[PDB]
Structure formats: C-alpha cells, structure tokens
Amino acid sequence: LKHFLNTQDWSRAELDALLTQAALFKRNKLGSELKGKSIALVFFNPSMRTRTSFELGAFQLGGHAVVLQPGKDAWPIEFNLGTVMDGDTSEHIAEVARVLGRYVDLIGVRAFPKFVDWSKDREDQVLKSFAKYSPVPVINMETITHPCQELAHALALQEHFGTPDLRGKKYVLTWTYHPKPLNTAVANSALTIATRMGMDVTLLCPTPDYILDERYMDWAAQNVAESGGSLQVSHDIDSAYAGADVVYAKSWGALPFFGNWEPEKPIRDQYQHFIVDERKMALTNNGVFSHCLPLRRNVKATDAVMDSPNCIAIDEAENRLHVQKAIMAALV
Amino acid sequence: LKHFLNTQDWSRAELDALLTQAALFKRNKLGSELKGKSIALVFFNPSMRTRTSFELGAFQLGGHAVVLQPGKDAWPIEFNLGTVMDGDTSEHIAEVARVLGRYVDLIGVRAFPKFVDWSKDREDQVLKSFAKYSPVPVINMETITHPCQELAHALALQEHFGTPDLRGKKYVLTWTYHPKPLNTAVANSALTIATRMGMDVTLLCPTPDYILDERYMDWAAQNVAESGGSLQVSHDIDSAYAGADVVYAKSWGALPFFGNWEPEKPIRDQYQHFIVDERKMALTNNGVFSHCLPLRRNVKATDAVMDSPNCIAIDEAENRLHVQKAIMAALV
Amino acid sequence: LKHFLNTQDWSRAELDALLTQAALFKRNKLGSELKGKSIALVFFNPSMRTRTSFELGAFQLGGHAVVLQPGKDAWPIEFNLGTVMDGDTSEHIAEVARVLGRYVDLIGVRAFPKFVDWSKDREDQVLKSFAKYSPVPVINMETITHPCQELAHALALQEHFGTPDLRGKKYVLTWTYHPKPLNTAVANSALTIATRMGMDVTLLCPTPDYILDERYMDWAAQNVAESGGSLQVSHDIDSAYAGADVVYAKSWGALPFFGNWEPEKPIRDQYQHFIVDERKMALTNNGVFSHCLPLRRNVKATDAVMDSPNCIAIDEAENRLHVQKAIMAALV
Numbered sequence A, B, C: 001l002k003h004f005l006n007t008q009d010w011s012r013a014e015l016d017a018l019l020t021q022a023a024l025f026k027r028n029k030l031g032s033e034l035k036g037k038s039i040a041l042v043f044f045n046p047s048m049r050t051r052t053s054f055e056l057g058a059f060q061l062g063g064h065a066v067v068l069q070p071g072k073d074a075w076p077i078e079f080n081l082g083t084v085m086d087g088d089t090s091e092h093i094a095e096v097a098r099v100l101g102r103y104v105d106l107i108g109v110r111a112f113p114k115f116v117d118w119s120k121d122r123e124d125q126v127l128k129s130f131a132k133y134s135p136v137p138v139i140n141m142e143t144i145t146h147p148c149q150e151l152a153h154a155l156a157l158q159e160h161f162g163t164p165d166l167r168g169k170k171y172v173l174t175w176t177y178h179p180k181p182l183n184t185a186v187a188n189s190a191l192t193i194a195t196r197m198g199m200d201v202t203l204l205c206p207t208p209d210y211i212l213d214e215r216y217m218d219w220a221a222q223n224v225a226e227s228g229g230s231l232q233v234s235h236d237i238d239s240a241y242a243g244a245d246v247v248y249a250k251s252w253g254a255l256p257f258f259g260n261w262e263p264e265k266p267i268r269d270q271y272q273h274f275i276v277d278e279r280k281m282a283l284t285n286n287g288v289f290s291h292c293l294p295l296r297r298n299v300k301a302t303d304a305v306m307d308s309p310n311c312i313a314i315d316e317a318e319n320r321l322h323v324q325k326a327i328m329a330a331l332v
C-alpha cells in the first residue's frame, strides 16, 4: 500500500509525475478522480491553508472530506502499545485507523510534536501509527516534515523560473525569528525538497545549535549527491543571501533545547535581525522570497518584503490545492 | 468588485432584484448558479442560523462551503497594519484574504465588536479588511450591521403583507431587555432596511442613551427622505406599539457606555418591562412580531407572543436561506 | 410523523426491512435517496464514528450533512418550558427545532445525560423536545439509548452467523471496568436489541446496583416474551461467559449512585477483573466479542481479545454507515 508520508519515500519520477498532474489540475480544477470517494482529515493542531485546500480539493474532484479534530469533536486517541488506557485517551489508533478504513478511502493526518522530548517527537509516532493500522493510503498533512508543502513550494519555484529543471539555482533556506520555539517540519521539508531538486542549498541559521536533525542533514546529502546540487551550512547572513535566487524563511526552536526551552528564549531573542527585510533581499540575485505561512509580519518577514512583487508566498499557498489533488488522485 | 457589505451600498433596484431572486429560489431551491464554486465562511463568533443556511445554500446551488473559525481551527488573524506581530495573532488579513482568494470564489465573514471601545468597533475593521485585500466578493455575515438579516426580514414582511410595496406600514423597532449588553448590528440593520422600504419607523428604546449611532440615524433619514417614509424616536412604550403593523425586537447595549458596562447593568435592569408581551402586541393594528434570533424566552419576548400566530420569526429565519442564495448567485 | 428515536417504537417487520435495506446499501453504497436533501447533526457531546458515518452517509446518497455543536459553534439551547432565560442558554428548542425544520429534511441529535440526576436524565428531554417541535423526522444519535448502534450490532451479528434468525444464540451483555462512570445508553440498547432478536440474554454485571433501569429490564421482558428468547441477570463471570455465542462489553455507572458518584469509585474499582480477556472468551462457545467503541485497551478489553479474530467490533462500527443510510432513506 502506497502512502504519501514523505517525498523522500518517492522516486524522482513519481515526484515529477505528481508536479505535472498538479500543473494539469491547475488548468482544469474540476474532475471526478474522487467521484463518490472521501477522505478523513485528522487534525491534532490548528490549520487554515491545509484544511481548506483539502476540503476543496476533495469537493472539486467529486469526493468529500470529513474533518475530524481528536479532543475537540472526535474522541482523543492513544498511540502507545500495551499501555493501560485509564487516562485522557478514549481509544487506540489501532481501532481508529481500521474504523476510518471502513468509512473513507484516504486518511490525512496532522500532528505537530509535543515539544517535550525530541527523541520522542522525531520518531513520528502518529503518522507511522496511521500508516501501519490503516487499510487505506495515509497522507502527511504535517508532523515533523511537511511533504505537501514541499511540492507546493517546488511547483511555485518551477512556475517562477518557467522551467522544471531548477539545478544551478542558489537556494537559501533561512531560519528567522519568532517569540516562541516552533516545529522544524517545514525546514526539514524545505531542505529535503530543495536538495532533491538539485539546487545550491545553504542552511542559514543563527548558531550550530539551530542546525536541523541529522536525518534531514543526511537525506539532504544523499539528495545532493544524486541531483548534482550542493548543501552548505552558514551563520553569516550577508554571505548567504549573497546573490541567491530563492529564499525560504522558517522559524524553529533549536533541537538541543527541546524540553528545556527556558534557556532558549534569551538565545533566540538575540537574533531578531535574521528577519527577512529589503536589505537581505537586495543582496540577492533578484531572488524570490517565500514562506509556508501562517507568517507574522515585521517578525519573520517585513511588510516591505511581503508586499514585494518577489514574494511568491500566495502562489505557493495556492499550489497546495493543486499538488494535493495530484496526491489524492494518485493514492486512490 | 462588488461585495455585499451593506444594503445601503446597493441601489433600490438591485435590492429589489435580490428579493425577487430570493422569492424565486424559494420556489426552486436546487440550482447550479454555484456549480463547482465554493465559499469560505469565516466566523469569529458563534452562529446557528447563518452557518447552516449558507452551508446549505452553497450545497443547494452546486457549490461548497468551507467553514473556518479563526482561533478554534484556523490560525488567529491580525488586522492592524504595521503592527509587530509577536502576540496572539499568527497571520495578517492581507495574506489570509489573498490566500482564500486562491481557494474560494466568495468569502463570508462574521465578526461582532469586542465591546471595549465603540470608536474602534464602529470602524468595522474586519469586514473592511477582507473587502480590501480579497480578490473575490466579500459577504457580511454580521459585524456592526446584519445586511443578510435585513433582506430575510424585508422578504418575510412583504410575504406577510402580500405585496412588495411596504410604504404606509407602521414599523416599530423596539429595544428589549437582556441580562447583558449586546451588539447593535441587527438594530442598525432593522432601521436601515425599515426606512429604506419606506415605512413609518419608530425607534422605541428606554433612554436617549439607547439611541443608535448617528451613522444609522442618518442613513435612516436619507432613506426616509427618499422612500417617502418617516423616522421617529420614542421612549413611551404604549404610544409606540399603538396600532403598529410590524414590531421588531432587539436588545443592545447603550453606545455611550461601551467599554464601561459596569454602570449600565443597573440601568438596563430597570427596564425589563420593555419585553414584548401580549399587552403591547394587543395595542397594535393586528401587528406582526419578529426577532432575528437567537431569542431568549420570557426575557425578550414572552412565551405567548412567540407562540402567537402573529410571530413571523421562523419565516424570517427560513428566508435567510433564500435571500443569501440570491446574494451569492449575484456576486459570482 | 415517523422518527427513529428507539427500535422499540418500531415493529419487527420495519426493523427487519431496515436491516435488509442496510445489507443492500452495503452492496451499493452510492445512491440518490437523499439527492438535494440534508440533515442537521446536532452533537451535545463528542463523536467520531457517528459524526463520520452520518456525514458520509448523507454524501453517499446525494444529500448533505450540516454538523452543529451547541455551545461550541451554534448557540446553546434551552429545553425547559416557561423558564426565564437569563442564564447560559441563548435560545429555546421550540425555535431551534422549527428553524432547522426550514433548512433541513432530517435532524439527528446526540445528547448524553448530565449525570447529576437520573430521574431527570431518564426523561430523555432533548430527544423528546426535538421530536415534539420539529416538523421533520428526528433521529437518535445517542442519548439514554443508542438505537443506531443497536442495528449496526444486529447486522454484524447476523452477518457473522450467516443468518437473519439469531434465536437460540447465547448472548451475554457484560458490564466492564472504566475509571469513570459512563452512560448506560449502549447497555440499554444492547439489552433491547438482543432480546428483540430472540436470543438468550444474560445481563452480567458486578452487583444488583449495576442492573439497568427498569424501563429497559421491562422492554427486555416484553421482547423476550414475544421473540421466544430469554432474559437473565448474573453476578458470576464464569457461569455467564460459559459457552456463549456473543459477548458485548459496555461500562456504565450504577444508576443508584447517579448524582453521588463519590462512593462509587471504591465500588467499581474493586471489579477491574470484569475486563474481557482471553480467559473469559475461552469459556465461550467459540463466541464473538464486540463493543460499541470508543474502547480503552487493557481496561475494558485486553489487547489479545481486541486483536482476536473473534472481535467483530470494526465490522459493527462499519455497519453504522449502512444501517443509518437505511434509516434516513426511510424517514424521508
């Protein structure tokens, strides 16, 4: 059974076929690839873009999305095996996944880490659980990686450059400031897709403490080695932005401080200048700026940069709709 | 780009065309004016009638509604420009409106005031924001005016009197009691539509303190001057209800006390007798009673009056469904 | 006007016709029995299976479900008559039911007891209210009985035994442990349907205090007397499970302690061994095990029993989808 947990699990041919099916669904939004079909969108965290583009994607293709929010409307779920359920959890993923498997044809899941222990959050339990117990294809709507976002990003970039081949482009994934520590998911996905496309990735971040988990630093290397691109870590703003083509911002808490965020505020608070402004963007080769959103103005990007005609954020967001229909149409 | 923020923004011909398209959709509920189309219903406050009649209206016309609740499921939104977003808000209306503009064809928004400062609530920021940043038509689902409610009311009244011409009818918009201060939205809309239809409007309320904001008192005058109706403020119950044809109840907090509600409870608490009962209703010319709902029994209206065959509240409510399909079918 | 409040309100012929229409909808899930129609699913409590199978059932039949949650998104509702609504409730069921009656074609309601006074919870006020004030058929989605669950259970049992005639089968409805006291709804429904099918029902529970309300003990008797089955209460685990064919587990708080749960914890806490494990299940005539779900592992059933090929829980759950389409298709 094929799922869409990560882009890394897919061959470059399938990924490419996806982006093309996306480009296609963008010219003809209505279809019946999902006629009479349905998808259960399980959200364990907030969502605007994802929730809306899936529900509309299912509709536009003849299917129907059922949005569930364990804890709010649906009963809370347990993921640990053998555990004696006398706590907050009402049922186990083993039952829930099989039950959903009788109602729907596809299951999408969104579950951000708990931020209490990266050793535990990085195992990606929820997604793995759904994938194991579900008889229908499971789709990652973001956990510790955001694969759907990756494709919406890659398509927006290809559209911008008017070509599918993005090799030779200087890609700069940059950490950016945020009052609180956030999920590395989008960053891990930016790196994975940016290196997979064969670009010149530079992971700009404040201190070595902000470097992404090794899993993604290694996926990145394997991707570089096989796409003819390159990976490079930096801690100098100007040198990085220096004549770049693409600039992706994303704020995230330093993994080494997971569970012990107290002594991290003082650290991140002394780097608010990583904010993408006109200055950095100027140092770029007439580069394009984007962010996964929700983006906080004058904190991550400045009003100027967002209002800049070089910000392809809204196009990337809109592509979430097209790229996801490509994934569903494929998995069924 | 045409929106449906207020009925005042529309000509009497368009309004009339709307009510007729509504009367029409009431004879043939199913259609395809919205086939393959969709609408994002953004609620920043509770809703039963509105939420249900839009979601069903979109369905009945071949489209699809996506209900979003910023703060609950969707990320919380910021409306002030330039502000440095390091607070509760996760993204800005400038991004959200443009993003929705890529997914849906219509955007409905509901946002009651915050009741902390009328000077600020009366600017109608949220609706104005959506209208400014959105590339698709925006629909007011209630903020400081309730335009959709207006039309559902006007249609129910016309249906009752068996004619579209409501001139010469004695309309009495009356304040009514409620344990807590409420939005003037429906009252401002009752006045706006009642005077726009050319009726003999009497704004009955406890003390001059309860008179509606000048904006609506002036819209009302312009409407009277152009419809051949009349406007009149009263503080005497009996004299008002006196041989009236229509009676609309709506409880709202006194604007002069916005932000300082403490000294208002004692005031409103000494006017519970404004409750619409059989007595007042008797003093009317076999008048009809209605309320926008949700209505609290034995507080705003008495069990008797609600169960009275002269209460056209449920018909008005039901018309929300028909009148709104007329608005959507028009805006697309 | 016909509703689906309880299976007891229906003749054995109609029930049978239902299960057959369900078996039929299971072979052809898509249909148009509800084309252009809609149903308002009112939930006053959490739900996963119910919410999803109704929303999908409505879709699969050409209709559309509108999910409402009074208190969360919809305005909170009042059910007592004459009461002076100056409290938490914003509107009365008398208005709400009539309003919904203008938007939808069917109304489903879910409202668990409040657990403060069984004398009050057993009157089944909410469901009765909707049934009284609504002009469209009302459907019980669970209150103090779970009729939809009953049929999903009966169909799963018939499917298992490869026959519609379940007479002569030893059915054992067993109480099971749970950290907190729960609704007897499913138990009352298990008993009602198990005796209605003409099986040999044994209501196994800890102490006489755990025996179901008389209403259901009497419905049960009338059902036994008319189906040729039998009813029997037990307090001995082994003797009951002893060569049984079906075993249904369900945890519920003892009625005699409703409102005074403090002195019940110590009581239920000394019966955790009622948990359905391999041992009890072995003492059965190669029996089948099922539970309505959400089920807590190693508390109500053991991992073993749930993973056992004799657990028809997921099939019962899946049948909720088919049996409910039979009910809707019928009521319209």
Ligand SMILES: CCC[C@H](NC(=O)CCC(=O)O)C(=O)O
Binding pocket: A075, A089, A090, C182, C183, C184, C185, C186, C292, C293, C294, C296
């Ligand atoms: C279909 C069962 C619904 C409900 N169950 C609960 O409320 C138990 C929830 C839990 O154990 O968390 C009940 O007991 O009636």
Ligand SMILES: CCC[C@H](NC(=O)CCC(=O)O)C(=O)O
Binding pocket: A182, A183, A184, A185, A186, A292, A293, A294, A296, B075, B089, B090
């Ligand atoms: C697509 C991004 C989702 C999420 N973002 C947040 O949780 C930040 C929310 C905020 O700043 O309010 C994240 O960081 O992964």
Ligand SMILES: CCC[C@H](NC(=O)CCC(=O)O)C(=O)O
Binding pocket: B182, B183, B184, B185, B186, B292, B293, B294, B296, C075, C089, C090
């Ligand atoms: C259509 C009316 C919506 C809203 N009503 C309330 O917020 C009153 C709610 C209550 O009384 O519980 C208002 O006053 O504008």
